[PDB]
Amino acid sequence: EPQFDVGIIGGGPAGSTTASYLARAGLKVALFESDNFPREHVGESLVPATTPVLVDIDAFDKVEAAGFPKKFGAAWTSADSGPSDKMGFTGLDHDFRAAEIMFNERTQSGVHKDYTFHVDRGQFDLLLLKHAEEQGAKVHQGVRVNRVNFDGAFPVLETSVAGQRAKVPVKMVVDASGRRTQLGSQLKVKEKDPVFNQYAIHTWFDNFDRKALAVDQSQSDFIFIHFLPVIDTWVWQIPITDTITSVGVVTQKERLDLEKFFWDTLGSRPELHKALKESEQVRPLKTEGDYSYALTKVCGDNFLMVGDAARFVDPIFSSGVSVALNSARIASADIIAAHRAGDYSKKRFDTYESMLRRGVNNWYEFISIYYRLNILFTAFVQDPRYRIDVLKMLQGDVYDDEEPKALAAMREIVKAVEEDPNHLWHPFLGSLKA
Ligand SMILES: Cc1cc2nc3c(=O)[nH]c(=O)nc-3n(C[C@H](O)[C@H](O)[C@H](O)COP(=O)(O)OP(=O)(O)OC[C@H]3O[C@@H](n4cnc5c(N)ncnc54)[C@H](O)[C@@H]3O)c2cc1C
User: Fold this and answer.
1) Could you say which DSSP state residue 69 is in?
2) Is 33 annotated as a binding residue?
3) Diameter of the chain by CA atoms?
4) Is the N end or the C end of the chain the one with fewer CB atoms within 10 Å?
5) Dist. CA 146–CA 252, nearest whole Å
6) Looking at residue 117, what DSSP letter applies?
7) Could you identify the atom of ligand 1 that is nearest to the CA of residue 202?
8) Which of 286, 128, 281, 126 is closest to 200 using CA atoms?
9) 321 CB under 6 A from ligand 1?
10) Is the CB of 365 under 6 A from ligand 1?
11) What's the per-residue H, E or C state across 322-376?
């Protein structure tokens, strides 16, 4: 039998977190990362559901010590003021133009702080990858996994070392290759979402004064997500340091030169546009895929996928890294139990498969509602009857519940509205549907 219990493809948040859980449990873990860290990567704003996982693997203190900007909350704004009839919803202080939350408004199990972080992902992924090594994981960088061979009793990772093929047998493979979906693509189980086909254009700016433009100065270090309903396009502002800010524009592929589209979109708000033009652009505009997909298989005999390698959803709720960390957590529990049973057949991962489906279905449905009736999202966040149940989702706490209270409530309102073209809210239904 192979020396190594588990071979991990990729050393981003999902891969490094998996390595840390498994190494801490005493399994022999080999991890292979194609790049050398640090390397640039989008996806910077965390939610607090990352916290219990960072504490589990004892990485929270290092992350806190690194000096990433603290994130106490989030704001979602829209260009649409919405209907005059608020239908009994309260807390809409700016019509339907603005919703805002602080994470500390709801007590979250395993979370001991009022804040999470926004992170330079180059630095964050390096920090976590070195941490995994310190836990006892065997980490390789500059070493790509080209394929997984299933011809033997145990899977073999075919890696590439200076143009040479190095075949590494392991008992169990974890694909944590992110959007590269290394194993899902090999197995041909990857299904692109017919509807969520987003792409992003984004960069960093230096010496843009977040606090100067903020309508609530105390909130200048929140993430801000601005929605443009008419063109189903969103715009992010994410703190990177005290002086650097990440700004991105996200839109359907069909709607997509690029530099001009980026700026015209930001120009929907002349003084943000101005402030950014007058700041220092510290990186080229980058355009990348942001499209949704799901694998029809996320596990099988001697393999499973975690993080983006398993599924992707539009990160309007800053969800991705929390899925990476929590899929790692849940998958690692099944792997440790499988190791204890001396068997890695598909059934060993039934719980991981169900929980991943449940949690990311919850995100997907939440995201669907945001797009389908955005004014209802705004109302549910703001109205104190529903705010806390909605905040549970926004905190990333989506693994608890096959049928979250807020999601079911919102779902039937969308239905009621869809099925009555007389509804005063009917005209606000968005074109992006399920
Ligand atoms: C535009 C955009 C904005 C986003 N914003 C946010 C946000 O605000 N908050 C948030 O939480 N999430 C966000 N996300 C999502 C987030 O970036 C991902 O969910 C996250 O990176 C998932 O981590 P991961 O470890 O699964 O994948 P990754 O972080 O991508 O890591 C995978 C690693 O695998 C390596 N790899 C790939 N193939 C191979 C191979 N064959 N062999 C070896 N190594 C390999 C790669 O080099 C990479 O380092 C955003 C995503 C996009 C596209």
Assistant:
1) P
2) yes
3) 69
4) N
5) 31
6) E
7) 1
8) 286
9) yes
10) no
11) HHHHHHHHHHHHHHHHHHHHCCCCHHHHHHHHHHHHHHHHHHHHHHHHHHHCHHH
CATH architecture of 1-434: 3-Layer(bba) Sandwich (3.50)
Q: Residue 385: how many CB atoms within 10 A of its CB?
A: 12
- 55: annotated binding-site residue? no
Ramachandran quadrant class, 120 (left: phi over 0; alpha: psi -120 to 50; beta: rest) = beta
Nearest to 35 by CA among 180, 141, 186: 141
Residue 16 and residue 412: Cα distance in Å, rounded? 39
Would you say the CB of residue 239 lies under 6 angstroms from ligand 1? no
CA-closest residue to ligand 1 atom 41: 145
Cα(204) to centroid of ligand 1, in Å? Answer: 18
Token couple for 184: 């899902």
The answer to whether the CB of 43 is under 6 A from ligand 1 is yes
Cβ proximity of 57 and 24 under 8 Å: yes
| Residues 26 and 48: beta-carbon distance below 8 Å | no
Q: How far apart are CA 175 and CA 307, in angstroms?
A: 9
367 lines ligand 1 (CB under 6 A): no
Q: What share of the chain is helix, strand, coil (3-state, %, to 5)?
A: 40, 25, 35
- Three-class secondary structure of residue 81 per DSSP: coil
Resolution of the experimentally solved model in angstroms: 2.0
Query: Which of 285, 312, 356, 307 has the alpha carbon at shortest distance from 197?
Result: 312
The tokens describing 19, both together, are 């390595």
Q: Is 265 touching ligand 1 by the criterion CB < 6 Å?
A: no
Query: How far, in Å, is the centroid of ligand 1 from the Cα of 93?
Result: 36
- Residue 116, SS3? strand
* Total length of the chain: 434
For residue 148, give every residue at least 6 positions away whose Cβ sits within 8 Å of its Cβ, in sequence order, or none.
Answer: 9, 155, 156, 157, 158, 173, 175, 182, 183, 186, 303
